Amino acid sequence: QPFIVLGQEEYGEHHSSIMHCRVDCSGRRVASLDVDGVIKVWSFNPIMQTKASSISKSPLLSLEWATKRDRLLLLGSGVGTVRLYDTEAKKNLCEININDNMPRILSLACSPNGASFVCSAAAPSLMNQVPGRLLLWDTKTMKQQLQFSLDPEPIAINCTAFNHNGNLLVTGAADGVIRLFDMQQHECAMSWRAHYGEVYSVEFSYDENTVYSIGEDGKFIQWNIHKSGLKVSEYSLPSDATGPFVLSGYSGYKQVQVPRGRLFAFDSEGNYMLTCSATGGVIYKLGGDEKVLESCLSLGGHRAPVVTVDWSTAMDCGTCLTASMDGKIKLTTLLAH
């Protein structure tokens, strides 16, 4: 018992499989998006209530909360647009086109200091092994500054994360390569082949000596950020951590979701890691070299596959989100004991 579970609640306002659910930077709000393009904004403390609900005419692929104006949400389309939405005022502030050669805005990341964001923009799926770009923007003007070259070739980038100061950005791509960018020099500091297949999620460790990745080969790997492609540790997660996520129903009919949202999330200090499973969130203790890393807590509560997760700390309380293919989002409240 590294945690006491104080409760588990269900947010059930979505009627379709969940794509993304992220807690805002104040830790008091959720933005959630499903595969029908329904975006919902809601609070959960002390109870669940919906602040806003909109159906996007445009398909939506990505979503990211702003870091300093914490009421602002970025939404990335499948039609080569980034919209800026004010959740307090319930209206779009602007919508910007990139070029239409690459309509799929697969990832958004806001810099900690609030001055910039990055998005990835990818060509249409055929294999996701298609060209893509990585764009740097100015938040205040909502104008593109610059685009990072990708070696050896343009490639779809699935996942982005900044470090604590925002001087580093780590990315994972469809060609299985992680690229770490120096955001002051605006160059690739480091890159290495991380996975056989796509990279789905990436993150800096709390101490920022390592980065974590998870990819299509089912592996969770920790990399030495000081030496390119030197593994620190490596585990085969259960296959239901990385999908593909399937919901059948006897009919010959099934729904299939490939990873799109975050597949892992962490507690405030990066000692624990939440992952997906068929039946709910599964948490592992990080740090240590047990040959088989073992579950320390199973959050349970899902009757359909969990496809993305989040974890945030606020008022010294942990809140875990688990989202499944039936639309349901479980909110589990964790106290560090």
Ligand X SMILES: CN1C(=O)[C@H](c2c(-c3ccc(Cl)cc3)[nH]c3c2c(=O)[nH]c(=O)n3C)c2ccccc21
In the complex, the residues that contact ligand X under the rule CB under 6 A are: 66, 69, 72, 74, 84, 93-94, 110, 114, 117, 139-140, 142
Instruction: Give 26's DSSP letter.
Output: T
Minimum CB distance to ligand X smaller for 10 or for 88: 88
CA angle 46, 50, 51 (to 5 degrees): 105
Per the rule left: phi > 0, alpha: psi between -120 and 50, beta: everything else, 309 is beta
Q: In whole angstroms, how close is the CB of 156 to ligand X at the nearest point?
A: 22
The Cα 105–Cα 114 span in angstroms is 20
Instruction: Please report, as a single letter, which amino acid is at residue 166.
Output: G
Amino acid at 132: G
* DSSP conformation class of 240: G
Beta strand spans in 35-149 (E): 38-43, 49-55, 60-65, 72-77, 81-86, 91-97, 104-110, 116-122, 132-138, 143-148
Q: Judged by CB, which is closer to ligand X: 95, or 217?
A: 95
CB of 110 to ligand X, least distance (A): 5
- Closest separation between CB of residue 15 and ligand X, Å? 29
Contact 4, 334 (CB under 8 A): yes
Question: 110 or 283: whose CB is closer to ligand X?
Answer: 110
CB of 142 vs ligand X, minimal distance in Å: 4
| Least distance in angstroms from the C-beta of 137 to ligand X | 8
Q: Between 69 and 285, whose beta carbon lies closer to ligand X?
A: 69
CB of 74 or CB of 334, closer to ligand X? 74
Residue 46 preceded by cis peptide, ω within 30:
yes
Closer Cβ to ligand X, 67 or 191, answer by number: 67
What is the closest distance, in whole angstroms, from the C-beta atom of residue 72 to ligand X in the complex? 5
Residue matched to tokens 């005022």: 89
